[PDB]
Amino acid sequence: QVQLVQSGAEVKKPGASVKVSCKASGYSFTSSWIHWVKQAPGQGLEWMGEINPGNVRTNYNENFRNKVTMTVDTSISTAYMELSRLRSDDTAVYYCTVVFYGEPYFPYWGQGTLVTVSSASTKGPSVFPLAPSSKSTSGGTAALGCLVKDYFPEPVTVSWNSGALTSGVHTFPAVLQSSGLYSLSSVVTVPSSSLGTQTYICNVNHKPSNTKVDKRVEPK
Amino acid sequence: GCKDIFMKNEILSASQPFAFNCTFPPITSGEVSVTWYKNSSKIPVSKIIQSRIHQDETWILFLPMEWGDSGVYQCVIKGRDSCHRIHVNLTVFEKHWCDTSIGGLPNLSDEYKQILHLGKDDSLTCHLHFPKSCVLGPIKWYKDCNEIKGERFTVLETRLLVSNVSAEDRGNYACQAILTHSGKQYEVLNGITVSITE
Amino acid sequence: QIVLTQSPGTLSLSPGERATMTCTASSSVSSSYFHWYQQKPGQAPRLWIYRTSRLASGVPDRFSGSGSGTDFTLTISRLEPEDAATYYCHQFHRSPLTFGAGTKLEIKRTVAAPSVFIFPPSDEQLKSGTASVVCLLNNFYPREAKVQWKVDNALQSGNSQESVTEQDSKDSTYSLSSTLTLSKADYEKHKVYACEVTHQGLSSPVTKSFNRGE
Ligand SMILES: N#Cc1cnc2sc(C(=O)O)cc2c1N1CCc2[nH]nc(C(=O)N[C@@H](CC(=O)NCCOCCN3CCOCC3)c3cccc(Br)c3)c2C1
Ligand SMILES: *[C@@H]1O[C@H](CO)[C@@H](O[C@@H]2O[C@H](CO)[C@@H](O)[C@H](O)[C@H]2NC(C)=O)[C@H](O)[C@H]1NC(C)=O
Ligand SMILES: *[C@@H]1O[C@H](CO)[C@@H](O)[C@H](O)[C@H]1NC(C)=O
């Protein structure tokens, strides 16, 4: 199966540089063109360029002519995208895609990598449980969650029961607090009858600060 | 009063020398006159040798095929008591895979795919179909946009012999030859997606 | 640059209706190089239509792509809730590759009232000197909901933050989270923490409350 796995989110100071990786698998790395796409927050898709791992030929969009550098390491089937002299409008999600001969379109995309250009200090979040109770029931349904508070920059990923619990989950878009730090909650509705036998653990990940927290949400 | 035959398969070519022979047996096997037409049935393709598009014998020759040449081409095969009009779509693409992935081979048709058999002594073929007026020199072979150099790889006429085929032989191949016509040289480059079966 | 002008920017329609989005290219684009992508919030774009009219794997028959030259169209013959996403046109004909600005398709469904839930601050957070109270409005429609915080029947102002989800791909509803944040000292100065929700689906405002500790 053709797969593209990118590196995690990063935060970098203005003027600095960032290198995003894209590990490929499921096909012959040198027989294809790897492309990079920029998605600025609130904006659509912008094409940055392409690299052929076979002959290391690169073709960039004139808009990224002096900003981007695309390289590959064929030994580990990995493409790299490097932005230099970072500025505010380089904050965006970056995707890698692959193109095959005779198929001029993008059928396979990486998951994306958020790059934040900021002078502010990276901070990992604090995870608090949002415990179920009598004021959290509705038709024999109970709501519970996790409050992922005070982190910078975006993003945090939240999963429930290591990915086994996805049904009824709502992970909210983060809010910017007056402090400059972000905060979000991730909730789930479950049967209140089994609150005594089931375990609900939220798994919070904040790659920029290397924070990985697991928090068990117990009934109050 | 001419029997129209519409061909279902389109022919794809890069923006380079290209030729198509009006071979439609047994219709073209008798004592017939073959005439090519471009998006027309009233003005035949010119027979001027110095013309970029011209008829050479029973062939339509593009030296080179360029953006704008895509369309329906007709071969009118006239016999004593018969007339047939074969309609074939000829499509040109501008770019080559090793230069860029943009605006190139629009789909992977059978004329751009080949297979090599695992563990066997097999070969790849370079398809260069041109009239006698076109002389083709030796063929250079490429894999993944680099020239092929190996002990298991041998060049023989239009074939690339591959001994002891391995799974690592999958990839994009390219065969290149110099075509000479009326004292002028042109370059032909064909890509091939090569897969392996056990 | 082949500029792709996509329209409309937003489309709000009911299930079973016909959705139409156009893309006008500044220069002629060959049909084998014209494609559409579907993108849901938080995810990578997904190939939807390729070669103008070919459906990508997993794309339902209700989707249809057509066009030539400088005019292309994506049509959904009978909308399902799972069609809510942003769609983008794309050309692979001439460098640089360009995409349209997108057409965000919103799905109009019947009025759904929110299920309201309230969460007192955790003991772990109270220990650190801060107290955040969360009010949750679950699976409602339309997205217009009004959440008021009341501490001992006193309407609060200036100490809360709201966040709404994208539209759900199965039921076309929205969910909202309101967090009231106070210091531990200010949290202890009051007893009744309540959030009152007003929505089109509620005949009278719903109030979810708790007494600090009790
Ligand atoms: N009677 C009848 C009949 C009626 N309706 C349809 S619709 C349809 C169909 O396929 O849809 C096929 C038929 C049909 N046929 C039966 C009899 C017959 N006899 N010949 C051909 C033939 O398809 N000819 C190819 C060239 C070739 O021979 N190709 C084989 C090798 O290709 C690579 C070599 N090149 C070297 C470069 O020049 C072309 C050939 C051909 C293709 C296009 C134009 C021309 Br005019 C010639 C046919 C097809
Ligand atoms: C190109 O096509 C022509 C047909 O238009 C082929 O010529 C025919 O060949 C057969 C077999 O020798 C003869 O019986 C016919 O009389 C020929 N017809 C004409 C009009 O010449 C020719 O062989 C093809 N050339 C190649 C290289 O494939
Ligand atoms: C050939 O081109 C014409 C004109 O665009 C088109 O209508 C027809 O479907 C094409 N046929 C094939 C076999 O591609």
XYZ file of C-alpha atoms and ligand atoms in Angstrom:
723
model
C 0.000 0.000 0.000
C 1.438 3.478 -1.038
C 2.015 5.542 2.150
C 3.588 8.945 2.944
C 4.381 9.665 6.616
C 5.530 13.155 7.565
C 7.416 14.471 10.610
C 5.573 16.142 13.483
C 4.691 19.783 14.002
C 7.409 22.323 14.683
C 7.809 25.844 15.976
C 10.761 27.987 14.817
C 11.870 31.579 15.458
C 11.725 34.136 12.601
C 14.848 34.105 10.381
C 15.518 30.438 11.346
C 14.991 27.429 8.985
C 12.907 24.253 9.184
C 13.201 20.869 7.480
C 10.071 18.696 7.113
C 10.448 15.015 6.222
C 8.189 12.720 4.160
C 8.968 8.977 4.459
C 7.577 7.028 1.467
C 6.660 3.322 1.194
C 4.606 0.893 -0.930
C 6.324 1.649 -4.255
C 9.774 2.289 -5.862
C 10.930 5.657 -4.395
C 13.147 6.623 -7.393
C 10.355 5.941 -10.012
C 8.145 8.919 -9.014
C 7.933 12.692 -8.392
C 7.389 13.904 -4.822
C 5.483 17.219 -4.610
C 4.991 19.633 -1.693
C 1.770 21.611 -1.046
C 1.288 24.556 1.375
C -2.015 25.181 3.140
C -1.977 28.499 5.003
C -4.483 28.622 7.919
C -7.915 29.708 6.696
C -6.570 29.433 3.066
C -6.620 26.709 0.371
C -3.853 24.868 -1.446
C -0.650 26.312 -2.937
C 1.814 24.220 -4.958
C 5.435 24.647 -3.931
C 7.339 22.331 -6.202
C 8.436 18.831 -7.163
C 11.568 16.611 -6.840
C 12.396 13.441 -8.824
C 14.271 11.068 -6.459
C 15.729 9.273 -9.484
C 17.778 12.165 -10.934
C 17.346 14.707 -8.039
C 15.827 17.229 -10.485
C 13.815 19.961 -8.683
C 11.256 22.374 -10.137
C 9.946 25.079 -7.802
C 7.029 27.532 -8.054
C 8.633 30.997 -8.602
C 6.831 32.080 -5.352
C 9.082 29.723 -3.323
C 12.226 30.143 -5.560
C 14.483 31.399 -2.729
C 12.488 29.996 0.252
C 12.386 26.247 -0.394
C 14.982 23.485 -0.923
C 13.847 19.950 -1.731
C 16.203 16.997 -1.181
C 15.874 13.188 -0.825
C 17.667 10.362 0.966
C 17.023 7.362 -1.283
C 18.582 5.002 1.302
C 15.654 5.652 3.682
C 12.979 6.508 0.977
C 12.567 10.013 2.461
C 11.915 13.364 0.819
C 12.733 16.624 2.663
C 11.393 20.133 2.327
C 13.398 22.948 3.838
C 12.198 26.506 4.332
C 14.834 29.135 5.089
C 14.658 32.661 6.628
C 11.252 31.960 8.163
C 8.594 34.636 8.506
C 4.944 34.852 9.744
C 3.372 33.803 6.404
C 5.442 30.591 6.357
C 3.155 29.354 9.261
C 1.020 26.753 7.452
C 0.345 22.982 7.167
C 2.734 21.378 4.627
C 1.839 18.210 2.694
C 3.826 15.840 0.584
C 2.222 13.977 -2.393
C 3.464 11.471 -4.957
C 2.891 11.335 -8.763
C 3.335 8.265 -10.995
C 4.147 8.082 -14.740
C 1.015 8.473 -16.821
C -1.065 9.516 -13.778
C -0.916 13.328 -13.564
C -2.830 13.855 -10.277
C -2.281 13.450 -6.470
C -3.870 10.172 -5.208
C -1.710 9.842 -2.087
C -0.941 12.527 0.421
C 1.004 12.666 3.677
C -0.907 13.611 6.871
C 0.451 17.181 6.959
C 2.909 19.029 9.194
C 2.062 22.293 10.899
C 4.974 24.716 10.970
C 4.561 27.689 13.275
C 6.919 30.640 12.923
C 7.055 32.192 16.391
C 9.457 33.921 18.767
C 7.398 32.682 21.791
C 8.543 29.833 24.023
C 7.176 26.324 23.436
C 4.980 25.105 26.295
C 3.434 21.656 26.778
C -0.167 21.353 27.978
C -1.760 20.436 31.304
C -4.381 17.668 31.001
C -7.348 17.705 33.385
C -10.297 15.259 33.358
C -13.865 16.437 32.649
C -15.498 13.759 34.863
C -19.039 12.380 34.312
C -21.768 13.013 36.960
C -25.605 13.578 37.348
C -25.121 17.012 35.619
C -23.503 15.078 32.660
C -26.425 12.707 31.764
C -28.986 12.833 28.901
C -31.230 9.836 28.042
C -29.007 7.344 29.851
C -25.982 8.850 28.048
C -22.999 10.290 29.944
C -20.499 12.883 28.746
C -16.877 12.947 29.827
C -13.691 14.503 28.444
C -10.287 16.081 28.840
C -9.297 19.683 29.179
C -5.967 20.222 27.406
C -4.999 23.645 28.789
C -2.099 26.173 28.301
C 0.053 24.976 25.358
C 1.978 26.632 22.587
C 2.073 26.346 19.647
C -0.621 24.301 17.857
C -1.375 21.408 17.510
C -2.374 18.843 20.080
C -3.772 15.538 18.950
C -6.197 13.734 21.206
C -7.203 10.096 20.946
C -9.384 7.959 23.283
C -8.431 4.461 24.568
C -5.365 4.468 22.254
C -7.548 4.810 19.159
C -10.127 2.119 20.137
C -12.724 4.791 21.073
C -13.659 7.107 18.152
C -17.476 6.935 18.117
C -19.199 9.920 19.740
C -15.901 11.809 20.187
C -15.734 15.600 19.704
C -12.271 17.254 19.825
C -12.893 21.034 19.704
C -10.907 23.589 17.708
C -8.472 25.320 20.155
C -9.138 28.794 21.581
C -6.420 31.433 22.017
C -6.374 32.615 25.645
C -5.499 36.237 26.555
C -2.145 34.778 27.810
C -1.114 33.728 24.272
C -1.440 29.996 25.097
C -3.967 27.639 23.558
C -6.615 25.467 25.157
C -9.123 22.806 23.940
C -11.409 20.059 25.206
C -12.104 16.598 23.846
C -15.431 15.080 24.885
C -17.226 11.715 24.318
C -20.762 10.451 25.029
C -20.906 6.900 26.366
C -23.586 4.708 28.103
C -23.909 5.911 31.717
C -24.902 2.349 32.810
C -21.396 0.951 32.248
C -19.523 3.930 33.827
C -18.449 1.472 36.561
C -16.947 -1.216 34.296
C -15.487 0.784 31.394
C -12.239 2.731 31.347
C -11.873 5.991 29.443
C -8.345 7.287 29.006
C -7.604 10.290 26.783
C -4.205 10.253 25.023
C -2.874 13.763 24.459
C 0.089 14.445 22.193
C 1.837 17.815 21.737
C 4.795 17.125 19.386
C 6.373 20.658 19.563
C 7.254 20.182 23.266
C 7.575 16.314 23.166
C 4.590 15.986 25.528
C 2.624 12.713 25.520
C 0.156 12.435 28.418
C -2.443 9.721 29.138
C -5.219 10.781 31.554
C -7.835 8.396 32.986
C -11.272 10.046 33.321
C -13.053 8.490 36.300
C -16.668 9.130 37.372
C -17.014 11.634 40.226
C -20.388 6.938 -50.178
C -17.433 5.921 -47.993
C -17.646 3.427 -45.046
C -16.731 5.271 -41.832
C -14.860 3.307 -39.152
C -14.297 5.074 -35.825
C -11.347 3.667 -33.827
C -11.908 3.362 -30.090
C -8.260 3.649 -28.997
C -6.428 6.975 -29.034
C -2.728 7.150 -29.852
C -0.501 9.107 -27.478
C 2.806 10.690 -28.371
C 5.286 13.039 -26.796
C 6.065 16.348 -28.584
C 8.745 14.821 -30.834
C 9.008 12.887 -34.203
C 6.003 10.615 -34.593
C 4.558 8.480 -37.367
C 1.387 6.467 -37.910
C 0.989 3.867 -40.703
C -2.385 3.383 -42.353
C -2.305 -0.389 -41.902
C -5.825 -1.853 -41.875
C -5.742 -5.407 -43.293
C -7.291 -6.803 -45.397
C -8.708 -3.417 -46.543
C -5.189 -1.999 -47.173
C -3.830 -5.302 -48.594
C -5.399 -4.942 -52.058
C -4.721 -2.410 -54.815
C -5.735 0.662 -52.848
C -4.807 4.364 -52.567
C -4.196 5.626 -49.000
C -4.832 9.330 -48.143
C -4.346 11.001 -44.740
C -6.416 13.988 -43.524
C -6.110 16.189 -40.382
C -9.507 17.198 -38.771
C -10.718 17.343 -42.451
C -12.068 15.161 -45.301
C -11.632 17.782 -48.158
C -7.967 18.866 -47.848
C -5.483 15.985 -47.745
C -2.255 16.081 -45.721
C 0.552 17.591 -47.850
C 3.186 15.319 -49.424
C 5.959 18.033 -49.241
C 8.929 16.326 -47.544
C 9.970 19.618 -45.876
C 6.513 20.060 -44.257
C 6.352 19.420 -40.433
C 3.288 17.202 -41.021
C 3.262 15.263 -44.293
C 2.231 11.943 -45.852
C 5.156 9.584 -46.575
C 3.990 6.477 -48.484
C 0.952 5.130 -46.454
C 2.173 6.962 -43.246
C 1.448 10.351 -41.651
C 4.746 11.817 -40.407
C 5.094 14.502 -37.733
C 8.596 16.071 -37.561
C 8.031 16.930 -34.692
C 4.495 16.498 -33.355
C 3.665 19.733 -31.481
C 0.985 21.094 -29.085
C -2.060 21.798 -31.264
C -1.732 18.622 -33.401
C -4.177 16.691 -31.174
C -7.357 15.693 -32.977
C -9.099 13.275 -35.297
C -7.094 12.056 -38.295
C -8.576 10.128 -41.185
C -7.185 7.558 -43.512
C -9.209 7.238 -46.708
C -8.526 3.833 -48.311
C -9.852 3.827 -51.871
C -10.059 0.641 -53.919
C -11.688 -0.058 -57.301
C -15.169 -0.781 -55.898
C -14.680 0.222 -52.213
C -14.002 3.235 -49.949
C -13.204 3.238 -46.217
C -12.598 6.180 -43.896
C -10.712 5.234 -40.712
C -10.962 7.890 -37.934
C -8.196 7.701 -35.297
C -7.550 10.204 -32.456
C -3.881 11.266 -32.175
C -2.998 13.067 -28.907
C 0.219 14.920 -28.136
C 1.645 15.670 -24.684
C 4.262 18.411 -24.147
C 6.588 17.225 -21.345
C 8.935 14.345 -20.604
C 8.898 12.523 -17.227
C 12.584 13.138 -16.444
C 12.209 16.915 -16.926
C 8.915 17.256 -14.958
C 5.795 15.368 -13.881
C 3.516 18.198 -15.183
C 1.735 18.166 -18.586
C 3.221 14.857 -19.698
C 1.897 11.301 -20.459
C -1.848 11.797 -19.828
C -2.607 8.111 -19.166
C -0.684 4.844 -18.898
C -1.863 3.163 -22.084
C -0.565 -0.287 -23.139
C 1.992 1.296 -25.471
C 3.724 2.731 -22.322
C 3.643 -0.390 -20.045
C 5.796 -3.531 -20.172
C 6.381 -6.589 -17.956
C 9.562 -8.543 -17.078
C 9.349 -12.169 -15.780
C 11.043 -12.829 -12.393
C 14.086 -15.145 -12.411
C 14.060 -15.407 -16.222
C 16.244 -13.942 -18.999
C 13.774 -11.443 -20.476
C 13.891 -8.165 -22.494
C 12.299 -4.731 -22.971
C 11.318 -3.361 -26.391
C 11.723 0.181 -27.752
C 8.774 0.938 -29.994
C 9.935 3.155 -32.843
C 7.562 2.930 -35.821
C 8.647 5.229 -38.639
C 8.672 5.034 -42.503
C 11.868 4.036 -44.426
C 12.717 7.726 -44.921
C 13.557 7.873 -41.151
C 16.848 6.258 -40.102
C 17.219 5.392 -36.434
C 20.646 5.204 -34.839
C 21.565 3.139 -31.781
C 19.273 3.131 -28.751
C 20.339 4.405 -25.288
C 18.511 3.035 -22.244
C 17.604 4.696 -18.977
C 16.019 3.564 -15.724
C 14.646 6.061 -13.210
C 16.118 8.939 -15.315
C 19.720 7.661 -15.242
C 21.524 5.733 -18.013
C 21.437 1.957 -17.542
C 24.928 0.499 -16.877
C 25.026 -3.110 -15.754
C 26.276 -6.657 -16.370
C 22.732 -8.061 -16.683
C 21.803 -5.371 -19.254
C 22.735 -5.666 -22.918
C 21.574 -3.570 -25.896
C 20.552 -5.578 -28.976
C 18.885 -3.783 -31.945
C 15.531 -2.364 -30.574
C 15.599 -4.541 -27.408
C 17.214 -4.184 -23.962
C 18.061 -7.734 -22.891
C 17.766 -8.248 -19.131
C 19.319 -11.428 -17.748
C 18.176 -13.014 -14.439
C 15.267 -10.516 -13.892
C 15.019 -9.378 -10.221
C 12.111 -7.659 -8.348
C 14.364 -4.544 -8.085
C 14.076 -4.153 -11.917
C 10.642 -2.462 -11.592
C 10.613 1.214 -12.502
C 10.338 3.785 -15.220
C 12.450 3.019 -18.219
C 13.274 5.291 -21.124
C 14.707 4.424 -24.535
C 16.231 7.157 -26.696
C 17.333 7.121 -30.335
C 18.496 9.699 -32.898
C 16.205 9.774 -35.945
C 17.685 11.154 -39.201
C 15.392 12.367 -42.010
C 16.396 14.430 -45.092
C 19.828 15.095 -43.556
C 18.284 16.503 -40.352
C 18.460 14.874 -36.891
C 15.669 14.571 -34.311
C 15.567 12.898 -30.879
C 12.929 10.331 -29.903
C 12.423 9.448 -26.192
C 9.855 6.855 -25.050
C 9.025 6.118 -21.421
C 7.928 2.705 -20.119
C 6.448 1.742 -16.725
C 7.987 -1.673 -16.131
C 6.480 -4.142 -13.657
C 7.534 -7.687 -12.670
C 5.500 -10.930 -12.476
C 6.647 -14.161 -10.759
C -0.085 30.946 -14.093
C -3.371 29.202 -15.014
C -5.676 30.885 -12.523
C -8.628 28.733 -11.394
C -11.716 30.673 -10.339
C -13.943 28.467 -8.237
C -17.535 29.325 -7.393
C -19.544 29.482 -5.195
C -17.325 29.911 -2.123
C -20.033 28.391 0.106
C -23.051 26.242 -0.657
C -25.752 25.461 1.981
C -28.249 22.812 0.797
C -30.581 20.102 2.192
C -29.991 16.285 1.780
C -31.429 14.913 -1.467
C -30.816 18.250 -3.279
C -28.431 18.819 -6.231
C -25.090 20.575 -5.568
C -23.177 22.308 -8.360
C -19.747 23.936 -8.258
C -17.873 25.407 -11.164
C -14.252 26.129 -11.896
C -13.272 28.602 -14.637
C -9.662 28.392 -15.859
C -7.822 31.486 -17.192
C -6.282 29.372 -20.008
C -7.508 26.140 -21.631
C -6.726 23.009 -19.560
C -6.692 19.533 -21.162
C -9.314 17.230 -19.588
C -6.765 14.586 -18.431
C -5.151 17.256 -16.222
C -8.294 18.594 -14.476
C -9.119 17.175 -11.030
C -11.217 17.732 -7.849
C -10.222 16.992 -4.220
C -12.330 16.678 -1.095
C -10.971 18.005 2.221
C -12.663 17.589 5.616
C -11.419 19.744 8.577
C -8.182 18.465 10.158
C -7.419 16.108 7.245
C -5.254 15.950 4.113
C -7.026 16.528 0.754
C -8.361 13.365 -0.887
C -8.486 12.733 -4.694
C -12.218 12.824 -5.658
C -12.511 13.283 -9.442
C -9.564 12.868 -11.778
C -9.257 13.307 -15.574
C -12.352 15.641 -15.385
C -14.944 12.843 -14.901
C -13.319 9.684 -13.461
C -14.372 8.878 -9.878
C -11.574 8.041 -7.464
C -11.782 4.806 -5.403
C -14.538 5.082 -2.763
C -16.316 7.997 -4.444
C -20.100 7.446 -4.654
C -21.973 7.532 -8.012
C -23.940 10.638 -6.967
C -20.718 12.618 -7.760
C -20.223 13.586 -11.395
C -17.504 15.637 -13.049
C -17.735 17.332 -16.447
C -16.090 20.054 -18.522
C -13.619 21.039 -21.222
C -11.411 23.982 -22.206
C -11.807 26.625 -19.531
C -15.079 25.460 -17.852
C -15.422 22.572 -15.382
C -18.163 21.394 -12.996
C -18.566 19.041 -10.016
C -22.145 17.866 -9.387
C -23.730 15.942 -6.513
C -27.109 14.603 -7.753
C -28.586 13.845 -4.280
C -26.622 15.171 -1.252
C -25.863 12.936 1.727
C -24.551 14.255 5.113
C -21.054 12.777 4.409
C -20.649 15.236 1.499
C -20.025 18.205 3.859
C -16.402 19.226 3.107
C -14.397 21.813 1.105
C -13.796 20.824 -2.543
C -10.927 22.140 -4.664
C -10.358 22.166 -8.423
C -6.784 21.463 -9.684
C -4.839 21.624 -12.939
C -1.850 19.392 -13.736
C -1.365 20.838 -17.308
C 1.137 23.732 -16.899
C 3.571 24.783 -14.212
C 3.036 26.096 -11.605
C 0.217 23.752 -10.561
C -2.815 25.689 -9.358
C -5.903 24.939 -7.309
C -9.233 26.730 -6.886
C -10.016 28.610 -3.631
C -12.604 25.967 -2.725
C -16.346 25.500 -2.331
C -17.337 24.711 1.208
C -20.489 22.585 1.147
C -22.662 22.960 4.296
C -25.616 20.597 4.820
C -28.978 22.004 6.006
C -30.796 19.433 8.243
C -33.905 19.557 10.564
C -33.736 21.574 13.821
C -31.933 19.575 16.552
C -31.819 20.721 20.174
C -28.493 20.535 22.061
C -27.911 18.033 24.893
C -26.394 20.217 27.625
C -23.732 18.912 30.100
C -21.762 20.770 32.809
C -18.331 19.869 34.269
C -16.950 21.227 37.550
C -13.175 21.991 37.712
C -10.959 18.977 38.454
C -9.274 18.562 41.855
C -5.917 18.352 39.991
C -6.510 21.797 38.412
C -7.832 23.400 41.632
C -4.566 22.340 43.329
C -2.646 24.526 40.804
C -4.608 27.695 41.634
C -7.020 27.824 38.653
C -10.643 26.686 38.132
C -12.167 26.057 34.676
C -15.869 25.143 34.367
C -16.884 23.516 31.018
C -20.410 23.662 29.499
C -21.031 21.241 26.562
C -23.839 21.646 23.954
C -23.915 18.341 22.069
C -25.194 17.557 18.548
C -27.411 20.575 17.719
C -28.627 22.360 14.532
C -28.455 25.256 13.462
C -25.009 26.327 14.830
C -26.510 29.461 16.411
C -26.585 28.773 20.144
C -26.353 31.288 23.003
C -24.563 30.181 26.198
C -24.777 32.354 29.330
C -22.785 31.746 32.526
C -24.392 32.515 35.900
C -22.529 32.387 39.223
C -25.076 32.597 42.095
C -27.667 33.834 39.537
C -25.271 36.646 38.468
C -24.785 36.830 34.686
C -21.064 36.578 33.928
C -19.213 38.579 31.305
C -15.599 38.582 30.193
C -14.372 35.311 31.719
C -15.410 32.610 29.210
C -14.375 31.221 25.741
C -16.491 29.347 23.175
C -15.444 26.894 20.468
C -17.687 25.139 17.895
C -16.827 22.009 15.930
C -17.054 21.525 12.127
C -20.330 19.961 10.886
C -20.585 16.247 11.712
C -20.230 13.923 8.696
C -23.025 11.541 9.874
C -25.773 13.723 11.348
C -24.856 17.263 10.093
C -24.954 18.659 13.647
C -22.547 21.046 15.458
C -21.197 20.837 19.035
C -20.118 23.732 21.257
C -17.811 23.971 24.265
C -17.856 27.000 26.624
C -15.133 27.222 29.299
C -15.568 29.703 32.168
C -12.142 30.286 33.779
C -11.704 31.772 37.258
C -8.864 31.781 39.820
C -9.135 29.239 42.709
C -9.833 32.139 45.129
C -12.666 33.517 42.955
C -14.080 29.989 42.432
C -14.317 29.548 46.236
C -16.133 32.891 46.728
C -19.326 31.481 45.059
C -21.604 28.403 45.326
C -23.883 27.936 42.257
C -22.173 27.497 38.855
C -24.652 27.374 35.972
C -24.798 27.615 32.161
C -28.020 28.515 30.384
C -28.486 27.495 26.730
C -30.820 29.161 24.213
C -31.447 27.388 20.879
C -34.112 27.225 18.083
C -34.706 23.569 19.123
C -35.546 24.514 22.727
C -38.998 25.932 23.542
C -37.537 27.375 26.834
C -33.840 27.884 27.818
C -32.155 24.864 29.426
C -30.084 25.368 32.585
C -27.408 22.928 33.783
C -26.062 23.786 37.231
C -23.971 22.450 40.097
C -23.272 23.538 43.664
C -19.509 23.854 44.417
C -18.592 20.589 46.146
C -22.200 19.428 46.818
N -12.921 -4.359 -40.529
C -12.938 -3.790 -39.520
C -12.982 -3.039 -38.287
C -14.128 -2.246 -38.124
N -14.297 -1.466 -37.041
C -13.341 -1.416 -36.085
S -13.438 -0.376 -34.658
C -11.871 -0.979 -34.145
C -11.271 -0.506 -32.872
O -10.065 -0.955 -32.485
O -11.876 0.304 -32.188
C -11.308 -1.867 -34.984
C -12.166 -2.166 -36.201
C -11.940 -3.009 -37.314
N -10.764 -3.712 -37.415
C -10.695 -5.064 -37.970
C -9.802 -5.048 -39.243
C -8.530 -4.305 -38.938
N -7.405 -4.348 -39.594
N -6.506 -3.525 -39.007
C -7.022 -2.956 -37.994
C -6.326 -2.011 -37.103
O -6.805 -1.799 -36.001
N -5.187 -1.410 -37.512
C -4.531 -0.459 -36.617
C -2.999 -0.408 -36.819
C -2.310 -1.694 -36.446
O -2.235 -2.605 -37.257
N -1.801 -1.775 -35.199
C -1.110 -2.983 -34.766
C 0.363 -2.633 -34.425
O 0.334 -1.345 -33.770
C 1.636 -0.786 -33.531
C 2.305 -0.714 -34.927
N 1.871 0.509 -35.643
C 2.966 1.250 -36.301
C 2.465 2.691 -36.515
O 1.352 2.627 -37.414
C 0.254 1.824 -36.950
C 0.702 0.401 -36.546
C -5.052 0.956 -36.897
C -5.484 1.765 -35.840
C -5.952 3.055 -36.088
C -5.966 3.548 -37.394
C -5.514 2.751 -38.455
Br -5.542 3.409 -40.190
C -5.059 1.455 -38.203
C -8.400 -3.463 -37.913
C -9.496 -3.143 -36.936
C 2.207 0.186 -43.709
O 0.859 -0.020 -44.140
C 0.744 -0.481 -45.495
C -0.734 -0.539 -45.807
O -1.280 0.750 -46.018
C 1.421 -1.843 -45.609
O 1.434 -2.211 -46.981
C 0.713 -3.351 -47.356
O 1.463 -4.532 -47.051
C 0.810 -5.763 -47.406
C 1.732 -6.871 -46.954
O 2.997 -6.771 -47.600
C 0.569 -5.780 -48.915
O -0.116 -6.974 -49.284
C -0.224 -4.550 -49.344
O -0.343 -4.508 -50.762
C 0.458 -3.271 -48.862
N -0.370 -2.113 -49.171
C 0.119 -0.939 -49.593
C -0.889 0.151 -49.813
O 1.320 -0.766 -49.795
C 2.858 -1.795 -45.100
O 3.364 -3.124 -45.029
C 2.961 -1.144 -43.719
N 4.359 -0.939 -43.376
C 4.902 -1.332 -42.220
C 6.374 -1.078 -42.067
O 4.231 -1.838 -41.323
C -11.844 11.573 -30.456
O -11.970 12.997 -30.331
C -13.323 13.470 -30.485
C -13.272 14.983 -30.465
O -12.929 15.491 -29.179
C -14.192 12.872 -29.380
O -15.546 13.296 -29.531
C -14.106 11.348 -29.400
O -14.805 10.794 -28.289
C -12.651 10.884 -29.355
N -12.572 9.440 -29.502
C -11.720 8.681 -28.808
C -11.750 7.216 -29.120
O -10.960 9.153 -27.967
